[PDB]
Amino acid sequence: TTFRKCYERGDFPIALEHDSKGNKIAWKVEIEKLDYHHYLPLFFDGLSEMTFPYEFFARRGIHDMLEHGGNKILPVIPQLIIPIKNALNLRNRQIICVTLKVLQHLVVSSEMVGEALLPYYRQILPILNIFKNMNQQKRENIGDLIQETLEAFERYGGEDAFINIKYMVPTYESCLLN
Amino acid sequence: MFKNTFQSGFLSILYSIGSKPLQIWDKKVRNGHIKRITDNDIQSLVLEIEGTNVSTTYITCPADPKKTLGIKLPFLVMIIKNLKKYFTFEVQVLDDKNVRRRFRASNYQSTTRVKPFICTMPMRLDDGWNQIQFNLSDFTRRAYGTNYIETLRVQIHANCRIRRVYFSDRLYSEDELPAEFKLYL
């Protein structure tokens, strides 16, 4: 893939910490005054990537700028769209679990997200619609994460959000008035 | 070629005092010459490339066409002495789309031409020892609206008086430059 070679070449000053069996990280140059447009989706390609030690960077940094960078995602969303569905087609259980987690954090991160995402469901949803039900130690139940995603989504999405999600998902239920 | 090396710092590709500096520079000699001769102002050996026709005789990088350049830095500086003649040079790069593209700086050029695979630029300048400066991302952004990513080859033509070509990430000032970079007459 392209992001792995991009960093193997090197343009991201990110530091780290580490110990016996667990997790932690650092960085070298701050993100807010570097960029959220020229580097956000390129780094997101690491999500579709699955290889040590690159996935560490992906899984964490994706959260990191989410906490640290709220009022900038506004225009970058169509660029964000692509690696999402690429990883979804990649069809790996662990990868899609990591996705589900980070996408959960994405939607809850800030405002305006669902309303701007209005044009952008018919590509992300239906593959999940079919992922619904193939199947708490470390949050491993695919189906539970799926219903959590739909739950956190629809109420914040808006008004016809649920009806279009329903049109995707014939099981789908209301979390609003039932 | 040497991708494993560090784009950090400065990249002198050719520098005159090198004993045998022509490895990765394929030469195409025709009705011309390559010569290695001192100057009067720097009174130091420099390269001289001349020929009857400039398209016939030209130096290029890399030597193996089956190899790329592999450079990230978007800033280029050449140390040239104008010789009151007809010189040009060429660079080819790979972009955000992964389609190849060329830039053609020609001293004669009477106009500016944009072709889907290559851009052209006239060169006019003073005499004596002067300098070249260019920004790959700048020009690609302005012309093709794409985003510079890496370099793949570079070619230089005749009618030129040569000290050093080098690359840098940014527009560097005049004081961080080493003494050999700090040209004096």
Partner: protein, 438 residues
Amino acid sequence: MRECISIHVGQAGVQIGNACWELYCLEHGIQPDGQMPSDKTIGGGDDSFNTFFSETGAGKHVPRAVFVDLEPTVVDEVRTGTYRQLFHPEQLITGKEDAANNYARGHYTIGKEIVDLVLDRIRKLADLCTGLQGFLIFHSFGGGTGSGFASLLMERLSVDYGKKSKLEFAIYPAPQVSTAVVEPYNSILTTHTTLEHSDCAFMVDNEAIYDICRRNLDIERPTYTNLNRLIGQIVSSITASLRFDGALNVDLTEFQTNLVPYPRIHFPLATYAPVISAEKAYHEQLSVAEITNACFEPANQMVKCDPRHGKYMACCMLYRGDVVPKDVNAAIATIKTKRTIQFVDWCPTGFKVGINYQPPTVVPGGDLAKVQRAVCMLSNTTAIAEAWARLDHKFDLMYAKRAFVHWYVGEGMEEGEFSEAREDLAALEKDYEEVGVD
């Protein structure tokens, strides 16, 4: 409607156009007098003819063409020939001089005071046309006089009308045969002036058709009469899709779009399979399989190229004659099965079939055959760059000794045009090999 304009320049360029307009009066039976037999076709002028000839209520077809030249010899001989009553009187524009093979002489010195009149005539043709898809240009690379004038005309036509395609036919310089050593110069000038505004250029060479005439037509001493006849058949076969119809119909806009891939490279090569004597076709057989194999047969192509060396990128075929679709697609499937022909890995479909049923026409006193099936094949490939290699490694040396440049510089050009051209040529060959690279 589906009507256009024919433009002819250069005393070598005019005999071929003359033959073409003959073959265009043939099929609709336009008498050399100007009016039909007692049988009726005249009126407001709305049928297969209203595209080539304007026969308004006057009863005389007016060909929608203009012939221009600088040397009055050929234009006056055609003024005094057979079809002068048919040719519009001042549609035959004459100069009083020659360009002495100097491109810039033909461009600057004299062209300034004639472009006004020629553009006036073409605009007054524009008023009478309705759709006017465009123009058929007849000229030559090594234009002994017409090259520069034609380049200038094409540029100014481009700057005023940018909303219609241009299909052009220039006779390629003979690779190893030189009629004069000024041809590389004026050729390269024409190339750099035309490649960037020309739409679809087809090259043709005279040596190859000569060798064909001796090869299978079996005539050891061919002529311009014969060669012009054959190329007139070529252009008539292409314009048949315009005039008549069949199963489906195709058009020049499709030709350019489907054939030229990118900007720049729009230079396909021509072939016409069933060239044979009347006595041979009299008791030998013709059908789709063998005629297609012929159109791929290396001797049948009119450019000094090795399709083995090259690789194929696009192809169109126009089938004029009583045929059926299945065996066509079956034969083309067999070609797809074949191995040695090397298509590139970009277009798994690379063919533009066109069907028309009206038989290709014969000429009185001719050396063609009573055709029932014919296919004219156009193809764009990667093997032509070597001819440019030939012409540049011929150019370079004489440029290096700067021979004859005094003529051009004294008349008022500089070296920069030549400079420009040499790297343009290098650029062309390099992009050719690059797109050849997968």
